[PDB]
Design a protein around this nucleic acid. Structure first.
Ligand SMILES: [Mg+2]
Ligand SMILES: [Mg+2]
Ligand SMILES: [Mg+2]
Lengths: 141, 42, 52, 324, 101
RNA sequence: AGAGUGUAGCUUAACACAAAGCACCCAACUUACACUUAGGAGAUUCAAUUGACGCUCUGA
RNA sequence: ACCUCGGAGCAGAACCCAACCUCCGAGCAGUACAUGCUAAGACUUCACCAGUCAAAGCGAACACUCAAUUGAUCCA
């Protein structure tokens, strides 16, 4: 049977393959510095005097998905782009974008004061109710 | 002690008024500081 | 100023560990892991082994 | 012995005699920001990266913002932190404006461009809606990066795109069992009159996705190409083997890519059926194996090593009796 | 006479567990796939090749003294430290056929 | 009257999906300051590369 | 006065190495009470004896700070 011809070693070229199987390596070092590099994906939030941006970035530094108040999509329904509800809206929209991107797990790594802020707490809540976990599964050795 | 006026309850329209006043104040102080900056530079 | 004392568990009996304690302080009651019952249980001081 | 720097040494430019006069960071965040700026900048020394690497439009939008700012109720809500933004609406008009570029970013990250077109990138301008109908009432969408089970992808999906010839192709990049580079064709509809998709010529009948058990996640991409003028085109696995690069190369002149939509799939129960009766073959099963653990060359006299050392170098744990 | 220093130079193959450097003070900072022990010794977390680089130093916010030093720096200033990395040589694993079911 | 010209204070920010990023101000903590948090205000001088409205230097 | 341990002059830059001398210090203490169990790979005071770091795993939780702060066998 010509159909029953398979390679002894299977090759999968999917960049997300091993990550989803939870067998991919994470950068385990960098203990002296901040922040940790021990993640497959990271939620990174940029707070500006005019705009708030939230980003989902791979360890390699390639950007996957983004929710920026700079975009007209979010602008047109926002009174001001620099407040708590702006962050919450960005949270909800990014959660939607993440789900459709297939990213279900990421880590958020804030500074203590940013974590203490109510705005970022509500962004995190938007993440949770959005269907995105802010804790990554521990890799399998 | 604080038994003088423990109760502090106000309306909603007054909150709206307060917010507008603070916004106007922010704008006014920004303008005033701009005037100061202009004159000192001159 | 410190003494080494033996701590014996109420449960999973026959297991004990040594810890250092201020001499002038009262008898120690601790909550420590017991491998016999494979859980954290209460331990009491029985006697002072030595003075360190 | 000293060697002069091969470029501008950092912190050299800001170095002044007077330091009290110079403004300083007072916050952790300011330094942090400047640090990422420096990190991204190229350097002459060895780095981590080396080893691990319209006017009318504006006026209209301004007017809209002014009108939105005019109301009192929205401002009140914003203050109260109760204001909400409709997700459906923003998504709809995001797909129009900033959609294609975000899709391009997703495709780049998933490395579709490198596998399909050998590095060449395109912007998926036309919005594409693919949905796998499940039951008579439900439908699972195919976004960019979504994960869909093969059970749901058993039947041919509904394809809708608001545009006025076209062609669409579904390909499994990692689906191939023999050749790593090669991809599996699923269904290639050619010469599609507008939005209506049924009228299109069936070059190859639909085949459901078949990721092997324990072969990991498989990505399947729908590629929609705009057709300038009609052109002639052309269950056994050998026939299904193709490369998108070669096909597009030979049809480059009259045909250009316009839309991209990719989903993910794991092995499911339906895959067994696909292998059994449809392909008429035994199902291949894979497992993830790790390289054997490293042990240094065994010494005659292991010094200050535990007893268990010997167990590191023995093949069988069952006792041996030699000549006896 | 504590015999502390670099044990593995640049371009040396290391196995997981191998001690890269013993230091007493943080002369070399841990980078990628490099663990740090209690005694401040650097060890490889992965099998691969040892690299030394110069990277921008951003301390943990909780680290009080370091943050103080940071906040005393001029506006253009960035701190650099030496970092030890392990570039992993082998993939995590491979998929191979076990059963033609 | 001639010359040089031209984005909120600054920026050879703006290929575009966009008027962006630091500056600035108010409120809370601080005797203060600073940090942080919570809010606010902001612009391509006008008409078709060109012409004329604002700015600086040269005539009385 | 000294005999053991840690630091500086002191090897200008991997390690080691300045006898004698000139100075300093140590023979604790504080916080835990998983300061549980187990186990790849390594370092090592130029021997040995000692001493040091540690991935993964089991069980927990959401392998402490400090430069030294220490003692083999027998025997009880
Ligand atoms: Mg030795
Ligand atoms: Mg000696
Ligand atoms: Mg562990």
């Amino acid at each position: 049977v010509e159909n029953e011809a398979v390679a002894p070693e299977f090759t999968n070229r999917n960049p997300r393959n091993l990550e989803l199987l939870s067998v991919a390596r994470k950068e385990r070092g960098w203990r002296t510095v901040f922040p940790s590099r021990e993640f497959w994906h990271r939620l990174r939030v940029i707070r500006t005097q005019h705009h708030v941006e939230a980003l989902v970035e791979h360890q390699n530094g390639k950007v996957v998905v983004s929710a920026s108040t700079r975009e007209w999509a979010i602008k047109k329904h926002l009174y001001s782009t620099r407040n708590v509800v702006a962050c919450e809206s960005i949270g909800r929209v990014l959660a939607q974008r993440c789900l459709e991107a297939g990213i279900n797990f990421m880590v958020y790594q804030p500074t203590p004061w940013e974590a203490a802020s109510d705005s970022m707490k509500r962004l995190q809540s938007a993440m949770t109710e959005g269907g995105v976990v802010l804790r990554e599964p521990q890799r399998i050795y | 002690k604080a038994r003088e006026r423990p109760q502090v309850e106000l309306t909603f329209e007054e909150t709206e008024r307060r917010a507008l006043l603070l916004k106007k104040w922010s704008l006014y102080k920004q303008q005033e500081r701009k005037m100061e900056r202009d004159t000192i530079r001159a | 100023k410190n003494i080494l004392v033996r701590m014996v568990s109420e449960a999973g009996t026959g297991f004990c560990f040594n810890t250092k304690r201020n001499r002038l302080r009262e008898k120690l009651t601790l909550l420590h892991y017991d491998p016999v019952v494979k859980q954290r249980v209460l331990f009491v001081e029985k006697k002072k082994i030595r003075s360190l | 012995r000293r060697t002069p720097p091969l470029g501008p040494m950092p912190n050299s430019d800001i170095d002044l005699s007077n330091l009290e006069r110079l403004e300083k960071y007072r916050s952790f965040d300011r330094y942090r920001r400047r640090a990422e700026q420096e990190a991204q900048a190229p350097h002459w020394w060895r780095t981590y990266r080396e080893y691990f690497g319209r006017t009318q439009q504006l006026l209209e939008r301004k007017q809209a913002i002014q009108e939105l700012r005019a109301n009192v109720e929205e401002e009140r809500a914003a203050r109260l932190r109760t204001a909400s933004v409709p997700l459906d609406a923003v998504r709809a008009e995001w797909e129009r404006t900033c959609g294609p570029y975000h899709k391009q970013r997703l495709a780049e990250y998933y490395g579709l461009y490198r596998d399909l077109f050998h590095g060449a990138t395109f912007v998926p301008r036309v919005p594409l809606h693919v949905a796998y109908a499940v039951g008579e009432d439900d439908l699972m969408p195919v976004y960019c990066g979504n994960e869909v089970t093969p059970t749901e992808a058993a039947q041919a999906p509904e394809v809708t795109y608001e545009a006025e010839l076209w062609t669409l192709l579904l390909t499994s990049l990692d689906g191939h069992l023999l050749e790593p580079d090669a991809e599996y064709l699923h269904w290639l509809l050619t010469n599609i009159p507008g939005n209506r998709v049924a009228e299109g010529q069936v070059t190859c009948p639909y085949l459901p996705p078949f990721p092997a058990r324990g072969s990991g996640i498989h990505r399947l991409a729908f590629l929609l190409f705009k057709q300038d003028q009609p052109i002639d085109f052309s269950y056994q696995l050998a026939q299904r083997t193709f490369r998108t690069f070669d096909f597009y190369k030979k049809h480059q002149e009259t045909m250009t890519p316009a839309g991209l939509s990719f989903f993910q799939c794991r092995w499911d129960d339906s895959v067994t059926y696909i292998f059994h009766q449809l392909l008429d073959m035994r199902e291949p099963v894979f497992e993830f194996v790790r390289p054997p653990p490293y042990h240094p060359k065994q010494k005659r006299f292991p010094h200050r090593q535990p007893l268990r050392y010997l167990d590191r170098y023995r093949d069988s744990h069952e006792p041996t009796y030699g000549i006896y | 006479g504590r015999r502390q220093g670099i044990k593995k130079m640049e371009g040396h193959y290391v196995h997981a567990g191998n001690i890269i450097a013993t230091q007493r003070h943080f002369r070399w900072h841990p980078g990628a796939h490099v663990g740090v022990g209690k005694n401040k010794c650097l060890y490889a977390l992965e099998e691969g090749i040892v690299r030394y680089t110069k990277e921008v130093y951003v301390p943990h916010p909780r680290n009080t003294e370091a943050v103080d030093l940071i906040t005393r720096l001029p506006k253009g200033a960035v701190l650099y430290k030496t970092f030890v990395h392990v570039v992993p040589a082998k993939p995590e694993g491979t998929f191979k056929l076990v059963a033609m079911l």
